[PDB]
């Protein structure tokens, strides 16, 4: 059924303070290894 009389973006009413951070923490498993510049820091 085609419905355009309702707002479907109602999920953000239940977001907490840490939601972005736990989303990133759960996403951390799928991500690929990062490239390295060869040193720990530019000050090293």
């Amino acid at each position: 059924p085609f419905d355009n009389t309702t707002y479907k973006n109602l999920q953000h009413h239940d977001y907490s303070t840490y939601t972005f951070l736990d989303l990133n923490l759960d996403l951390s498993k799928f991500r690929m290894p990062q490239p390295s510049s060869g040193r720990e820091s530019p000050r090293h």
Partner: protein, 430 residues
């Protein structure tokens, strides 16, 4: 084709702009998103660049640079450093709220645009720099990115095409200057959001010193539709070198302030009277229009009658298209107070690295405060014109030009009103 506008709903790239449909993956996949992406990823980078530059798409950030050449600047063999595609989702320009709608309602279109753009220039990953104030939009984008990762559309072997691509979201911390591409690059790296000097261009030295291409949300989200429908379909709308569609935010003293997609060469009067329901008090109550947000000079009522909202015709009206943010002020508006508030915004949002903006923008703020009060003389009006000319073109970034331009437009189009203000202050206070 001479007349432009009245775009059909079948030609709109940004469906579900108003959020009336499902923004998640299941609803987006039924609207054409993530369709045949393996074919575009397997057709090569040069084919994608050719499809982009045949459509004639120009940058939607506000500079209006051609997108095909800018993206093909990174079509070079790598020298051991990775390459990065960075999406500018700051949107700190007043009057502009289109990217918030694109992120909040069509996140999967942005993710597919990131993947297609990264394949077009061999990017290792994607860094989306959203505004720090857009917490809910950032969380929606993270949810959609998680849904894309779990479905195998991005990550290792993205879309089954053998290409490896990651999408990251970085939240800002409330700085308008971080919308500048080099300042955005510096802010991603953990430094203060101060812009760099060019050269080196971001295609040579960008984020972490790697090759980097900074692209707007609007010019990235349309790229899968460009590669899918074709470049000639996008070029069929608009004039020469003004091809395609554009999202307009009509706001201010208007009946229905709204965000709407339209053809690029639409008349301003037709756009206002059709989509926004007209200005308050009818068209004869119009006093001034700022067509491209706070970074563009304003135009009076006599110019908005016969003007077109593309790059070239607005350039010929000694203003700019900008971010296509139409701010409307009627006859019940103090124009001097509005421009003074704009200059106060530019003084508050200025990184202060380079001398002319750091000193001169505060100087213009004080001068326009005295102009609002009327405590000046016309010699100071010409002095302010000279100061604005001194700021423009002598700065590191384009915030100085964006602070000089509105004052120049206000002076040029409303010098008699300012002069009447100061002469009535002089004759009242003495």
């Amino acid at each position: 084709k001479t007349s432009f506008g009245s775009l059909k709903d079948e030609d709109r790239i940004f469906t579900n702009l108003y959020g009336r449909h499902d923004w998640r993956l299941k609803g987006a996949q039924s609207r054409g998103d993530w369709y045949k992406t393996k074919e575009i990823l397997l057709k090569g980078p040069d084919w994608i660049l050719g499809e982009v530059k045949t459509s004639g798409l120009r940058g939607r950030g506000g500079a209006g640079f051609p997108t095909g050449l800018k993206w093909s600047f990174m079509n070079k063999p790598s020298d051991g450093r990775p390459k990065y595609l960075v999406v500018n989702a700051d949107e700190g320009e007043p009057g502009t709220c289109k990217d918030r709608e694109i992120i909040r309602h069509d996140p999967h279109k942005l993710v597919e645009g990131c993947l297609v753009g990264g394949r077009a220039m061999g990017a290792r990953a994607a860094y989306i720099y959203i505004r720090g104030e857009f917490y809910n939009e950032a969380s929606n984008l993270q949810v959609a990115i998680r849904e894309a990762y779990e479905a195998g559309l991005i990550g290792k072997n993205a879309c089954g095409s053998g290409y490896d691509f990651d999408v990251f979201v970085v939240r800002g911390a409330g700085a308008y200057i971080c919308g500048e591409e080099t300042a955005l690059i510096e802010s991603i790296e953990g430094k203060q959001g101060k812009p760099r000097l060019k050269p080196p261009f971001p295609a040579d030295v960008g984020v972490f010193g790697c090759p980097t291409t900074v692209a707007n949300v609007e010019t990235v989200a349309v790229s899968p539709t460009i590669c899918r429908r074709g470049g000639a379909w996008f070029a069929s709308f608009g004039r020469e070198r003004n091809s395609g569609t554009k999202l307009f935010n009509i706001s201010g003293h208007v009946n229905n302030p709204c965000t709407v997609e339209e053809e690029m060469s639409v008349p301003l009067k037709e756009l206002i009277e059709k989509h926004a329901g007209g200005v308050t008090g009818g068209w004869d109550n119009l006093l001034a229009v700022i067509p491209g947000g706070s970074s563009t000079p304003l135009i009076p009522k006599s110019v908005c009658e016969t003007v077109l909202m593309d790059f070239d015709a607005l350039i010929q009206a000694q203003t700019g298209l900008g971010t296509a943010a139409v701010i409307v002020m009627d006859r019940s508006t103090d124009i001097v107070k509005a421009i003074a508030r704009l200059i106060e915004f530019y003084k508050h949002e200025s990184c202060g690295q380079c001398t002319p903006c750091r000193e001169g923008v505060d100087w213009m703020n004080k001068v326009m405060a005295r102009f609002v009060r009327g405590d000046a003389r016309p010699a100071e009006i010409d002095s302010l014109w000279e100061i604005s000319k001194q700021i423009e073109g002598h700065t590191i970034c384009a915030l100085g030009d964006g602070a000089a331009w509105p004052v120049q437009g206000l002076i040029r189009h409303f010098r008699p009103e300012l002069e009447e203000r100061m002469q009535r202050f002089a004759q009242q206070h003495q």
